[PDB]
């Protein structure tokens, strides 16, 4: 086993003052361009927004969202029932726009077009920014114009494909199971984080457990399991998701699947790898070995 001030040590947070700056940052940036269309929100995602960040150095995960106008998955009957007009001002216009904001406030050299994301080297920290748009998510039986979950969403210019997240959704669940759990769930995935991250730099491997499927994974757990001592949560979390049935597990989001073929989605196999080195880093710390 792993002693229990190991484990309190693994639960820290990082700082997050620095992120704090960053995102102020991004946002000042913004809030000095003419905006032509609407003004989008500026939010953060990711570690710093859900208190799961290990390090106080890590880049920020910045949200820039345009709620001016949507898109959706209705048909265009759909549409002309909730009398929905077709926008003029595209994703790629937004995107545009936002690069444009960027670029005047920190300089050409500081902003720069990633795969997913505007990367954004700011005096604080660097920004992963997404450029998205409004997604609304309506039910199959479609008839009021109300009655939807709201995402967000942006193209992919490198393989012609659109991505749809819950970001919001994502932080609102994580923050009620950590309410529900008398907040052992935030300082858990920190503390499975850096034993990740401790084996990782040991020589396990590099995609051993993305942050992200870490904190999806672990939402599925019961919060009976999270409490007492960080020993007693390493053992119950691990010894739970042994047991369980990972083929329905959920994205914290509460939308999407956690495992599958889509590129957004992990693997059951990546995810029982992860709890075969838990479990070999737990029995594994006290003992003794000799040559056979
Ligand atoms: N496969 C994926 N599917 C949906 N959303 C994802 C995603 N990967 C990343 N994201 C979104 O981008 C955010 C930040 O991505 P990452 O930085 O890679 C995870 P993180 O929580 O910030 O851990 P970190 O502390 O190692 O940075 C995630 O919290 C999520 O909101
Ligand atoms: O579904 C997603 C995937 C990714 N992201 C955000 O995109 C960033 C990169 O996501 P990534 O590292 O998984 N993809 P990558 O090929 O490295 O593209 P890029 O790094 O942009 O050149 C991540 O750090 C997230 O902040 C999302 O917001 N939603
Ligand atoms: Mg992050």
Redesign the pocket.
């Given at each position: 086993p792993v002693p229990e001030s190991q484990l309190e040590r693994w639960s820290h947070q990082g700082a997050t003052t620095t992120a704090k700056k960053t995102h102020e940052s991004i946002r000042a940036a913004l809030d000095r361009y003419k905006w032509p269309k609407g003004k989008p929100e500026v939010y953060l995602?990711?570690?710093y927004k859900?208190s799961?960040?290990?390090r106080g150095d890590?880049?920020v995960?910045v949200v820039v969202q345009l709620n001016s106008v949507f898109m959706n998955n209705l048909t265009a009957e759909q549409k002309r029932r909730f009398g929905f007009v077709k926008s003029d001002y595209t994703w790629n216009d937004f995107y545009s726009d936002v690069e444009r904001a960027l670029t005047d406030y920190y300089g050409a050299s500081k902003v720069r077009r990633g795969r997913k994301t505007l990367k954004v080297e700011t005096t604080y920290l660097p920004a992963d920014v997404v450029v998205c748009i409004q997604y609304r998510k309506y039910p199959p039986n479609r008839k009021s114009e109300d009655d939807y979950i709201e995402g967000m969403t942006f193209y992919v210019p490198s393989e012609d494909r659109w991505v749809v997240?819950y970001?919001k959704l994502?932080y609102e669940n994580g923050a009620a199971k950590n309410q529900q759990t008398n907040e052992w769930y935030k300082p858990t995935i920190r503390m499975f984080k850096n034993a990740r991250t401790y084996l990782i730099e040991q020589g396990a491997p590099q995609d051993l457990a993305?942050?992200?499927f870490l904190?999806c994974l672990l939402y599925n757990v019961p919060d009976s399991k999270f409490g007492g001592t960080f020993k007693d949560t390493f053992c119950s979390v691990i010894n739970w998701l042994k047991r369980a049935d990972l083929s329905k597990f959920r994205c914290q989001n509460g939308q999407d699947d956690l495992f599958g073929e889509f590129p957004?989605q992990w693997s059951e196999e990546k995810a029982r790898r992860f709890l075969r080195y838990m479990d070999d880093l737990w029995t594994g710390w006290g003992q003794g070995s000799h040559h056979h």
């Open positions: 995602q990711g570690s859900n799961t960040n290990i890590s880049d995960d997240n970001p994502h993305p942050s992200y904190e957004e």
